[PDB]
Design a protein around this nucleic acid. Structure first.
Ligand SMILES: [Ca+2]
Ligand SMILES: [Ca+2]
Ligand SMILES: [Ca+2]
Length: 300
DNA sequence: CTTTCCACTTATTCAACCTTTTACC
DNA sequence: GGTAAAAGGTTGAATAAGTGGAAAG
């Protein structure tokens, strides 16, 4: 229902590569003729502060329902079957490029099973369980028990290229960070101001992440580990690269959500640095206050 | 019988954050 | 030497992904 301008379709695909998810529920249901009912869909869950992105996607595609996900988050879910055609037409024309493309392909296979009403019979349920085994986190314990002949095997790697800077604006709206690092320094003011751009992602998309270096013509990859988990970040710390390469990209290709406000505050700091005001008392004061009112410091 | 919606749950991949060290001139 | 750039990380929660129940014809 939003009357805000519609979201650009590539920005939407990039935001979905970041934050979207495909869903296939295969549920025990003793009122169904086959003993199972299904539900197929696409969904995005965000913090409450970004509910307006969900409204804007809802009004762009003209489909989906919005509901709370606990007290601090909100979802857009599309599962009405005819409305899934809008989702398929979109991602066929503006395709995903992360490993999530493999989940879209499994969703589309499932759509074809359900469109033929095959899932109302046991052959169709078996084909959906085969599809679901490869989808996201795979089969539940109960489905593994009911369908032991379905082996869980690893998926082929997706290797696609960034299509344009609109996709990148949508993806950065999901995964990006515009950070102002205030480094204790042996300098006259005692504080070094360093702007840091990052995009963060699991190691499954290392090839895509490395390609950001050539696509943007700057930056580097940092590797991370915590517990059983590994991920990467594309990082830019060189001020001329931030000012001449990163900032113009998102000035031209507008971010969505609260993160736009953080980007615009970050650009105020970059203008001060370009003017060397970050090495003055008044400039440092302004930058300290900007830090306190962006990202985690922003009130909601 | 099946679809659709709305309330609700949960593991970790994200974002955002820090300090210290080295590069550069 | 002093400023910029990179290195070397930590961690809490907004994401992704999933689950429970039932209204409706
Ligand atoms: Ca993501
Ligand atoms: Ca995000
Ligand atoms: Ca501001």
């Amino acid at each position: 229902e939003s009357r805000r301008e519609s979201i650009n379709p590539w920005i939407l695909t990039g935001f979905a590569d970041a934050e979207g998810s495909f869903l296939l529920r295969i549920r025990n249901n003793n009122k169904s003729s086959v003993g199972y009912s299904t539900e197929l869909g696409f969904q995005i869950t965000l913090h409450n502060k970004d509910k307006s992105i969900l409204e804007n996607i809802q009004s762009t595609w003209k489909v989906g329902v919005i509901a709370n996900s606990g007290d601090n988050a909100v979802s857009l879910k599309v599962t009405r079957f005819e409305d899934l055609k809008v989702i398929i037409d979109h991602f066929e024309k503006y395709p995903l490029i992360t490993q999530k493309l493999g989940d879209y392909m499994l969703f589309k296979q499932a759509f074809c099973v359900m469109e033929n009403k095959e899932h109302l019979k046991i052959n169709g349920i078996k084909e959906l369980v085969r599809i679901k085994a490869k989808l996201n986190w795979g089969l539940t314990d109960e489905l593994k028990k009911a369908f032991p002949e379905i082996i869980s095997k690893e998926r082929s790697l997706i290797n696609k290229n960034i299509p344009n800077f609109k996709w990148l604006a949508g993806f950065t709206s999901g995964e990006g960070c515009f950070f102002v690092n205030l480094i204790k320094s042996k300098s006259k003011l005692g504080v070094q101001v360093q702007l840091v751009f990052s995009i963060t992602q699991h190691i499954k998309d290392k090839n895509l992440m490395n390609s950001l270096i050539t696509y943007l013509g700057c930056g580097y990859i940092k590797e991370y580990n915590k517990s059983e988990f590994s991920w990467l970040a594309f990082v830019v710390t060189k001020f001329s690269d931030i000012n001449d390469k990163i900032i113009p990209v998102f000035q031209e290709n507008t971010l969505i959500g609260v993160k736009l406000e953080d980007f615009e505050d970050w650009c105020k700091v970059a203008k001060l640095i370009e003017e060397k005001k970050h090495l003055t008392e008044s400039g440092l004061d302004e930058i300290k206050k900007i830090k306190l009112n962006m990202n985690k410091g922003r009130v909601f």
